[PDB]
C-alpha cells in the first residue's frame, strides 16, 4: 500500500535504525516487499542489522516471509554468518527446516560457508540433519565436498 513501505525497505537495507523506528511509528507496512520479494526483515538479516531485526519482529514482521525463490530471513542470516540474528529469528519462531525452491535449508547454507556456531544453533532448534536438496545432498555431503573436517565431526 505505502510510499512509506518503500522507505522502510530502503532504511532497513542501508542500516538506518532511527529512520526504521520513525517509519514504523508513522504506520509503514512492516511486511512491505520489494520486487524480488524481500521484506525489511530479509534485508536486515542479509546486511546484518541486528537491532533492526529485533525492532521489526516486535512490530509484527513475518518471520517466515519467503522471497520469489522461496528463501526466508533465516536462510539469509545463516548463509551470511550472522549468528545473533539466527538466534533471534529462531527465538521468534523461524522455521528451521524451511526449504527454498531448490530444496535448500538454512543448515545447507551455513554448512556450505563453514559457519560452525550457526550449524550448532540450527541443530539445537531441530534442524533435520538429513534433509536433502534437489540434488540429494545433505549438510554432511557438503562438509565432505568442501573438505571441512570440523564440520563433518559435528554432523
Amino acid at each position: 500500500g505505502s510510499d512509506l513501505g518503500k522507505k522502510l525497505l530502503e532504511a532497513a537495507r542501508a542500516g538506518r535504525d532511527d529512520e526504521v523506528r520513525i517509519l514504523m511509528a508513522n504506520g509503514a507496512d512492516v511486511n512491505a516487499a520489494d520486487v524480488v520479494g524481500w521484506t525489511p526483515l530479509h534485508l536486515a538479516a542479509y546486511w546484518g542489522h541486528l537491532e533492526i531485526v529485533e525492532v521489526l519482529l516486535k512490530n509484527g514482521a513475518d518471520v517466515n516471509a519467503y522471497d520469489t525463490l522461496g528463501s526466508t530471513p533465516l536462510h539469509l542470516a545463516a548463509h551470511f554468518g550472522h549468528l545473533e540474528i539466527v538466534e533471534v529469528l529462531l527465538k521468534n519462531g523461524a522455521d528451521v527446516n524451511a526449504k527454498d525452491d531448490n530444496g535448500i535449508t538454512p543448515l545447507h547454507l551455513a554448512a556450505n560457508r563453514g559457519h560452525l556456531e550457526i550449524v550448532e544453533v540450527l541443530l539445537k532448534y531441530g534442524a533435520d540433519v538429513n534433509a536433502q536438496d534437489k540434488f540429494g545432498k545433505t549438510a554432511f555431503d557438503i562438509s565432505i565436498n568442501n573438505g571441512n573436517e570440523d564440520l563433518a565431526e559435528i554432523l
Binding site: 518503500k6 542500516g15 524480488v36 525463490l69 525452491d101 535448500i104 540434488f135
Partner: protein
C-alpha cells in the same frame, strides 16, 4: 584541463564483476611505461562496458599520450576475451568537448531509432567525418545488425539448442577462399583460368530464414525461421532516445586540433544541407547543441526498468514543452544514459533553449527555469529528478589497499559517510558518486548432475549466455555493407526466473535436459558499477565545504575522518581536488 585518454571496451551480456575481472584488471596491469601519467581511473558496469581514463600532467602532448596508451593496450589484446576483442577496444583523447551534437529525427512516424541510425551510419557519418575541420565523430546508435530472436519452445521441439543455431550460422553464412581453375603454377598450355566462387555471405532476413538446421527422420526440414524471428535491428538496445517525443539518432562531432570552430560548424551545416534532397520521407536534421543547453537528470530506484524510466522522461519532456513552451526549443530525452552510471533506471534530458533574445526578463533565464523545473519535478514519486546547468566541491577516492574486497570497502565508505554527516557545520552533501549494490540472480550450475547427465558445461554456458545476453556470431552483407549478426532469445523467453527452466540443453546421449535439472538459483546483492583508482578497487566520494568554510578546511576534516577507517582502507584526492 589536463589531457586525458579513455579506453572503452564492451563485453556483451557481461555483469560488472565479469567485465572488471576479465578486462579492466588485465588492461590496468598493462598500463606501465607510459610517460607523464598523473592517475588512472576506471569503471566497469552491468551493461558490460568498461571505461579506463588516464589523466596526464598539464602540457603533455595528447597525441603522444594517446599512442603510448594505445600501444600498450594493443599488446595486451591477446589477454582479453575474444568477445571483447571482437567489439573493438577504442583508445581516444577524451578531454576535448563537442563542437556540435546533431540530431536526426523522423517526423512522419515511419522509422524507429534503429532505422534512422542505420541510415546515418551508411549514408551520412563518413561524409561528416571527411568534412573540413572535423576530428572525431561518434554515432549515437549503430548500423543495423541481423537479429536472430530465438524461441526455446521451438528449439526443444526439434532437439536443438542455441549452440546448434550458432554453428549453423557460421557454416551457412560464410565466405571463404576456394581458389582457381587453372591457377599458377599451371599445366603448361592451359587456356582456362577462372576463380572458384563457393559460399557467399548472406544478405537478407529471407536468406537467414532458410538456413538449414537439420532434416528430421521423416524427411521434414527444420529451417532457422522455424525456431527464430529474424529482423534487421540494433547492435545494442540499452538506450532509447527521443527528440520532442519522436525517435531520433545523432552524431557527436569534435573539432580537429588546430581547426577553426566557426568555419567547421558552417562546413558541417553546408554538408548536411547537400544531403537533404536524398533523405527518405520525414527525416530531418536538428541542432540541439552547437558552439544555452541544460540538463535534467532522472534516476529511478534499484532494478527499475527502461519502460518505467521512459514514463518519467516523458513527463519531463511534456513539462518543458507545455509549461516552458515560450523558453524551450527542444528536449532530447535519453533513456539508459546518466553520466553517474549507465543502466535501465537512469536517464537524462538535454534541453535546448530558444535564443537569449527571445527570452526577456530574469524569469526566462536558465537559473529561474531550472529552479522552477526542479520544484515541479519534486512532486514525482519513484524517481529523483533534478534540473541543472553547468569550485566549492571536493573529489575524494576511498581505496581498498589490502585486498579487503567490495563488501568491506562499502562498509568503510558507509562509516565515512555517517561520520561526515555528524559534522554538518563543516561538510555538506558528502555522498557516493557511484551506484549502490542491487539484487542479482545467482545461478549455480551443478557439475555433478551435468556430468551424470552427459551435459557439457560449454553447451550450458553458451546456451545461457547466448539466449539471455546475446552473442555476436559473425558478419553479413546488407545492401553491399558489412554488418554484424547477433543471436539472442526473443524478449518474452528471457524476462523472469521462471523462463530459465524453458531452456533445454542437449546431452551427449541426445536427450534434451531442462536447466532446472542441473542448476539452482537465489537472490543476492552485488554491484552494477565497480570503480578503480590507480589500479585498486575504489569508491569516489563527492562533497562540499559548509557555508562560510573553505574547501581547504573541509578536505582536512575528510582526511581526519578517513584516518579512523578500518585497517587497509586508504584515500586519495583526484580531479578538482588534485
Amino acid at each position: 584541463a589536463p589531457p586525458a585518454v579513455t579506453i572503452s571496451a564492451s563485453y556483451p551480456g557481461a555483469d560488472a564483476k565479469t567485465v572488471q575481472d576479465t578486462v579492466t584488471q588485465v588492461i590496468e596491469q598493462n598500463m606501465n611505461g607510459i610517460d607523464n601519467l598523473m592517475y588512472m581511473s576506471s569503471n566497469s558496469d552491468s551493461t558490460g562496458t568498461v571505461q579506463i581514463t588516464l589523466t596526464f600532467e598539464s602540457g603533455t602532448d595528447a597525441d603522444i599520450a594517446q599512442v603510448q596508451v594505445q600501444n600498450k593496450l594493443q599488446l595486451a589484446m591477446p589477454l582479453l576475451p575474444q568477445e571483447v576483442q571482437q567489439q573493438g577496444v577504442s583508445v581516444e583523447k577524451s578531454s576535448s568537448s563537442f563542437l556540435m551534437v546533431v540530431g536526426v529525427i523522423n517526423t512522419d512516424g515511419t522509422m524507429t531509432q534503429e532505422d534512422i541510425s542505420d541510415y546515418v551510419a551508411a549514408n551520412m557519418k563518413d561524409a561528416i567525418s571527411r568534412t573540413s575541420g572535423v576530428g572525431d565523430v561518434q554515432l549515437f546508435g549503430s548500423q543495423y545488425a541481423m537479429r536472430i530472436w530465438m524461441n526455446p519452445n521451438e528449439l526443444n521441439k526439434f532437439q536443438l539448442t542455441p549452440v546448434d543455431v550458432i554453428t549453423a550460422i557460421k557454416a551457412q553464412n560464410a565466405q571463404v577462399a576456394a581458389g582457381q581453375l587453372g591457377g599458377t603454377p599451371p599445366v603448361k598450355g592451359q587456356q582456362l583460368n577462372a576463380s572458384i566462387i563457393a559460399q557467399t555471405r548472406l544478405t537478407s532476413t529471407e536468406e537467414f530464414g532458410k538456413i538449414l538446421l537439420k532434416v528430421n527422420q521423416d524427411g521434414s526440414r527444420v529451417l532457422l525461421r522455424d525456431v527464430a524471428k529474424i529482423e534487421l535491428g540494433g547492435e545494442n538496445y540499452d538506450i532509447i532516445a527521443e527528440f520532442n517525443g519522436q525517435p531520433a539518432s545523432g552524431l557527436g562531432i569534435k573539432l580537429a586540433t588546430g581547426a577553426n570552430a566557426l568555419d567547421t560548424a558552417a562546413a558541417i551545416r553546408a554538408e548536411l544541407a547537400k544531403m537533404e534532397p536524398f533523405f527518405p520521407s520525414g527525416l530531418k536534421i536538428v541542432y540541439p547543441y552547437d558552439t544555452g543547453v541544460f540538463m535534467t537528470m532522472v534516476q529511478l530506484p534499484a532494478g527499475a526498468t527502461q519502460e518505467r524510466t521512459q514514463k518519467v522522461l516523458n513527463e519531463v519532456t511534456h513539462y518543458y514543452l507545455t509549461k516552458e513552451k515560450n523558453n524551450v526549443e527542444s528536449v532530447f530525452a535519453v533513456n539508459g544514459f546518466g553520466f553517474a552510471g549507465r543502466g535501465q533506471n537512469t536517464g537524462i534530458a538535454f534541453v535546448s533553449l530558444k535564443d537569449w533574445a527571445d527570452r526577456p526578463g530574469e524569469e526566462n533565464k536558465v537559473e529561474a527555469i531550472t529552479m522552477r523545473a526542479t520544484r515541479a519535478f519534486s512532486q514525482i514519486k519513484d524517481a529523483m529528478v533534478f534540473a541543472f546547468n553547468l569550485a566549492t566541491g571536493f573529489d575524494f577516492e576511498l581505496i581498498d589497499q589490502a585486498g579487503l574486497g567490495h563488501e568491506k570497502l562499502t562498509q568503510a565508505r558507509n562509516q565515512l559517510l555517517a561520520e561526515a554527516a555528524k559534522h554538518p557545520d563543516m561538510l555538506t552533501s558528502v555522498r557516493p558518486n557511484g551506484l549502490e549494490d542491487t539484487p542479482q540472480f545467482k545461478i549455480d550450475i551443478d557439475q555433478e548432475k551435468a556430468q551424470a547427465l552427459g551435459v557439457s558445461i560449454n553447451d550450458i554456458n553458451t546456451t545461457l549466455g547466448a539466449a539471455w545476453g546475446g552473442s555476436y556470431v559473425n558478419d553479413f552483407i546488407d545492401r553491399g555493407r558489412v554488418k554484424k549478426v547477433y543471436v539472442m532469445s526473443e524478449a518474452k523467453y528471457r524476462m523472469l526466473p521462471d523462463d530459465i527452466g524453458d531452456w533445454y540443453v542437449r546431452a551427449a546421449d541426445g536427450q534434451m535436459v531442462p536447466f532446472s535439472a542441473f542448476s539452482s538459483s537465489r537472490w543476492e546483492y552485488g554491484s552494477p558499477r565497480l570503480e578503480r583508482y590507480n589500479g585498486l578497487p575504489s569508491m569516489e566520494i563527492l562533497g562540499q565545504a559548509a557555508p562560510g568554510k573553505s574547501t581547504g578546511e573541509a578536505m582536512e576534516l575528510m582526511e581526519q575522518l578517513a584516518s579512523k577507517l578500518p585497517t587497509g582502507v586508504g584515500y586519495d584526492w583526484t580531479g578538482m581536488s588534485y
